[PDB]
Structure formats: structure tokens, C-alpha cells
Amino acid sequence: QLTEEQIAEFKEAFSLFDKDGDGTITTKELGTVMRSLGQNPTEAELQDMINEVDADGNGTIDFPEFLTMMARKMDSEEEIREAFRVFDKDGNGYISAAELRHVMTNLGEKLTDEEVDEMIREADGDGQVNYEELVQMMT
């Protein structure tokens, strides 16, 4: 939709990453921000994040590349809906709130119980989480 205010907001967000001002985000600058927030990423994680945005293979991220990344939306609903199917055992379209909490807090990124609570509490009535509702909320 070619938003205008978003550019002013994005340029500010790009400035917090580009300490140089050379118009370029590098993995070192990406790790500097993540480490400032208490995160401990690896070089594989940092370059995976930059490879995902580095559209021209520069190895770095300029502002227009950042802007394209931020302008993306969410298609991608089929991939997310397919991700839940890995944990839908009965195939009915439901994951147990006990199962979801167990899989989400123990695997991958590891959500917190209160984070999973917001998932289950958006879900419906008895502990049967409808993941199709979740795919819809995020899209």
C-alpha cells in the first residue's frame, strides 16, 4: 500500500542497527543488538538472518533491503498450517492444550507457559486447541 509513516518508523529502526551510518547492516552489528538484549546468537544464526534479507547477496543489509523485509506480510498460511499437522496426531484439526504446551515449551524456540497461555486462551471450550483458528489470527 506504499505507507508513508512506516518509512519514518523503519528508517529509525534501521538506524538502531546501523551504528556506523554507512547504510549497511552486518552480522557483527546484528549480533551487537541481539547481545544488548540478553540474547546469545551464533554466527550461523546471524548469517542465516542476514541471508534471509540480503536480497543481492552482498553479505549485508542496506535500507531498501530492510524495507522490503519489513513491508512483507503473511501464502505463508499454508506452511504454518502444515507445521501444526506435524503435531496433530488424530488428524481432527485439534492439538491438546497439554500437548501444545508440552511441544511449544520444550522444542525449538521454547515458549514460556504464559506465552503458551495466550495461545491456548485464543485457541472453542475444553482443552482442544483449534489450530486453524491460530493460523487465522496470525494471518
Add this chain to the structure above:
Amino acid sequence: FNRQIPAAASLIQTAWRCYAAENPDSSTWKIYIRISQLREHHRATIKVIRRMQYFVAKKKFQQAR
């Protein structure tokens, strides 16, 4: 043994964390232990980082398949 169980979990986690961050009062903001107070400059860079991690978890899920 089924390399999608971790990849599918991370795609859901990163997609939800990216979606829950638009709510400034979500419980997803309470995970940044090392920050005494979450100022506005933290939330700007956190939104960006969570968007990148979703894109990585998006690609890693398609790669395992």
C-alpha cells in the same frame, strides 16, 4: 528422526512471537530478563529481530521438506 518436528515447532513459535509482538502488553515481552525496563528503542529492534527469525524458521521448515 523426523527433522520437521523441531523445524515445525520453531516456525509456529517464531510466527506467534512475531504476531504477539504487535500487542505491547502481550506476555511475550516478559521474556527479556536482562532488560530492567523495556524502552521504546528495545521494542523497535525486537520487532525486527523476531521478523528475521520467522523468515529463518520459514526457510528451515521448507528445507527439511
